[model samples]
Target: AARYDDILYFPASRYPETGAHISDAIKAGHSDVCTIERSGADKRRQESLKGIPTKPGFDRDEWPMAMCEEGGKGASVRYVSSSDQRGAGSWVGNRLSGFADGTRILFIVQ
Candidate 1:
């Protein structure tokens, strides 16, 4: 959690080439589905964000999405567990406990 922002993940496949466009989405909050796929005009912005050059993990092409919203700042990473039995009730609620990898990367923002 970054305290003031959400974690929005961009498929590492879009790295370098799709960096700026993704940055625009983060900076400008572009939620339009058509532009969310990271193609078309999304490839036009070459200007990078202040600190988005680092690759967080293995290259991912699925274009998965993660958002770290306001008040999400923290040094520790939070993961959503998939354990079958946590006794919390709903599967979604039980998985709120973030994992180690989640903490390691914290909020990659991309």
Candidate 2:
């Protein structure tokens, strides 16, 4: 069996879909994963999932959140830039590694 700690594998297409599930769970009771996003510069908005699942067409198990950049760039842009250099490219890997054992992460991929 693949070790859960070894990696988190999923269809890039379905990664974001978990966001709705996360949101739904939060609204009903509690929060799941922590979020980190760049704001103006190093600043970011960090909060546990909250509020009702408000986004239209958002289905918890059916469809999650789509991935997008600060400028709404496409997935190809993410793949290319993150693979080519450091900075945001390396951020995701570093963040995932920061989690403790048994921590389930729901990636909101576009």
Candidate 3:
């Protein structure tokens, strides 16, 4: 049995809100790391946002993302500019697109 190493870089300077959300979540004791998963994003997204409300111009961004095995209950959820999440998520989604389920991802926020 083997594992894949996938490092996800967060640019705080580029996407301040989105960046801070993830960075602060890790600071708040959530894992800065997660393993990529192929399913249940919708379900986890629902759980992470159970009581969180929606914003006019923001998306409820959760860390670890619903795409990660570490996401869901007890996850840090925040409201981020939809465009910001769009950019950051796009960058992330593109970078990790080719990885397999269970591939490890370490978040490096800067």
Whole-model Cα lDDT of every candidate shown, in order: 0.26, 0.30, 0.85
Query: What is the TM-score of candidate 2?
Result: 0.22
TM per candidate: 0.20, 0.22, 0.90
Per-residue lDDT of candidate 2, residues 1-110 (tens digit): 32122333333333333433333444444322323232321211111122224334332121111111121111111111222223322344455556653444554333
For residue 92, give model 1's deviation from the true position in Å. 24
- Which stretches of model 1 miss by more than 4 angstroms? 1-8, 11-14, 32-108
lDDT of 3 by residue, 1-110 (tens): 33337677777898888999988889888987778885988899889999898899999888988998899998998888899988988888888888888888888898
**lDDT ranking, best first:** 3, 2, 1
Tell me the lDDT of model 3 at 13. 90
Kindly list the per-residue Cα lDDT of model 1 for residues 48-75, writing each as its tens digit: 1222343343221111122211111211
Error of 1 at 82 (Å): 37
* Alpha-carbon runs more than 4 Å astray in model 2: 1-14, 33-94, 100-110
Error of 3 at 14 (Å): 1.7
Q: Top lDDT: which candidate number?
A: 3
Model 1 residue 16 CA deviation (Å) reads 1.4
